[PDB]
Design a protein around this ligand. Structure first.
Ligand SMILES: */C(=C/C(=O)OCC)[C@H](C[C@@H]1CCNC1=O)NC(=O)[C@H](Cc1ccccc1)NC(=O)CCC1CC1
Length: 178
């Protein structure tokens, strides 16, 4: 399991920078990666020390038009991500003993035992209403956004916020990546 996180870290999780700061990016498949929406990847992005062009970005919102705090971006490169869509479940899932995989330039290859991840649903993220969020009782900190919540060979969510005592992720579901 530990192992999974390592295969992930090694082939799919990358250190990035936007005009907003340092983030962890998850490469899902082909040239498709997912980032927090507040990372504001414009027309370009920095992927580990090199400027990469973004061909298309999509800010995910739910049926009612409510923010989901996720942005899908298509990169302009000759590299392809290993397909990990099969590790993402079809339904937003809870989990026990999750692990938050962070890979930032300030926090590289960092594993954090966030513990149990439970349904939370609505959340007020700094003035932006947000849906489909999950919560863990761990004091997550700045510079950790974009981290990949994982558990038993599953990629379940993307860290997006925290209040000093708890952390919140945007749930991941396979239908998002088609
Ligand atoms: C991750 C990204 C980051 O580095 O922040 C901006 C550069 C952080 C991690 C959070 C912050 C402190 N502890 C954490 O675990 N996330 C945020 O800063 C994020 C800010 C934000 C701004 C705009 C839209 C969405 C999110 N945190 C929050 O919003 C937390 C505040 C309440 C609990 C939601």
């Amino acid at each position: 399991s530990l192992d999974f996180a390592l295969s992930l870290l090694r082939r799919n999780v990358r250190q990035v920078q936007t005009d907003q700061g340092h983030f962890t990016m998850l490469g899902v498949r082909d040239r498709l990666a997912v980032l927090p929406r507040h990372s504001q990847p414009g027309k370009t992005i920095w992927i580990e020390h090199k400027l990469v062009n973004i061909l298309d970005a999509v800010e995910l919102v739910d049926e009612q038009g409510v923010n989901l705090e996720l942005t899908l971006i298509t990169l302009d490169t000759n590299e392809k991500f290993r397909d990990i869509t099969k590790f993402i479940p079809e339904n937003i899932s809870t989990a026990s003993d999750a692990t938050l995989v962070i890979n930032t330039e300030h926090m590289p290859s960092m594993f954090v035992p966030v513990g149990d991840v439970v349904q939370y649903g609505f959340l007020n993220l700094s003035g932006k209403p947000t849906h489909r969020t999950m919560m863990y009782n761990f004091p997550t900190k700045a510079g950790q956004c974009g981290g990949v919540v994982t558990s038993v060979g599953k990629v379940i969510g993307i860290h997006i916020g925290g209040n000093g005592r708890q952390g919140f992720c945007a749930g991941l579901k396979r239908s998002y990546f088609a």
